[PDB]
């Protein structure tokens, strides 16, 4: 049915960090050939409610974007993992230890005794570049929510929703064969 | 074996092993095919690819 | 009319094949009927 369609549940490819095509939700569907119109109305209302919930979930969670599935994602769109502050303590004072050794002292380490100072280093071990690329599972399930395609495949061929096909690259739009 | 008992053909995909072919023993697919040919094609002309 | 949903899902008394299918699919079938002929794969009801 075009009015109330089955949502297009996406498929995740956890090597490239991107969706690999989409297909209709043929797994979570309820049979109604044993039901008369009284329950047919209920089932249709349930499907419509599910479609509405999917649409509003898309509006809430999915980030706006021109392409349906950008294979390579911008750095800012990708949710980077937070990193804590690393505190490290310098154990030994090299210049004072060198002075003591030059004046004829042997130090067998394990605050020492001869060093009154005590310095600490605090820094953030951020990656040099903010890891532009694929999408993790959490962000994928957050953003690539099931799609409700109301009027299916109506119009010119270039107006169809591509990337529903599992084997389809956006660059040089075509289907990759063997 | 068409519309037989134990001898039932299957077109099931590898997904769920769910057969896409059901026979009822109340349906005559042989006669249906004969009528279909007699109504679509000029059956008075002999063909050798099938008998 | 206690069987209309069934007779519409299985196209016994529902809508014509030209207008329950995708319009793009209808265009494809009418474009490639000369050699590939999708037209005979879909049933359209005939209701008295």
């Amino acid at each position: 049915s075009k009015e109330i369609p089955t949502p297009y549940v996406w498929t995740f490819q956890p090597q490239m960090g991107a969706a690999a095509g989409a297909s209709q939700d043929y797994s979570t569907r309820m049979n109604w050939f044993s039901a008369g119109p009284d329950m047919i109305h209920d089932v249709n209302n349930i499907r419509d409610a599910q479609n509405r919930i999917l649409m509003t979930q898309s509006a809430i969670t999915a980030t706006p974007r021109n392409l349906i599935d950008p294979r390579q994602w911008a750095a800012h769109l990708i949710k980077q993992p937070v990193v804590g502050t690393t505190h490290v303590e310098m154990p030994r004072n090299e210049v004072l230890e060198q002075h003591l050794t030059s004046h004829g002292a042997q130090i067998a380490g394990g605050r020492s005794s001869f060093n009154p100072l005590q310095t600490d280093f605090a820094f953030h071990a951020l990656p040099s570049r903010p890891r532009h690329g694929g999408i993790g599972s959490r962000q994928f399930v957050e953003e690539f929510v099931p799609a409700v395609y109301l009027n299916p495949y109506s119009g010119p061929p270039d107006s169809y929703p591509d990337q529903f096909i599992r084997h389809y690259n956006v660059y040089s739009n075509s289907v990759s064969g063997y | 074996y068409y519309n037989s008992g134990g001898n039932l053909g299957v077109l099931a995909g590898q997904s769920s092993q769910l057969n896409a072919v059901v026979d009822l023993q109340d349906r005559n697919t042989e006669l249906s095919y004969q009528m279909l040919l007699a109504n679509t094609t000029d059956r008075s002309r002999y063909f050798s690819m099938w008998n | 009319p206690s069987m209309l949903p069934q007779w519409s899902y299985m196209h016994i008394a529902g809508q014509d094949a030209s207008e329950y299918l995708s319009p793009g699919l209808v265009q494809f079938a009418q474009a490639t009927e000369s050699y590939f002929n999708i037209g005979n794969k879909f049933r359209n009801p005939t209701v008295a």
Binding site: P156 | - | L21, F28, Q30, A31, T32, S34, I38, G39, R43
Partner: peptide, 30 residues
């Protein structure tokens, strides 16, 4: 595209078929 690239071109206009040509009904018991 227009799907006219998939049909033979009798000159310029494509040799498109009827819009309602799709679909069939052939069923009688006798």
């Amino acid at each position: 595209y227009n799907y006219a690239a998939l049909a033979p071109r009798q000159g310029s206009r494509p040799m498109l078929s009827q819009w309602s040509g799709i679909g069939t009904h052939e069923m009688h018991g006798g």
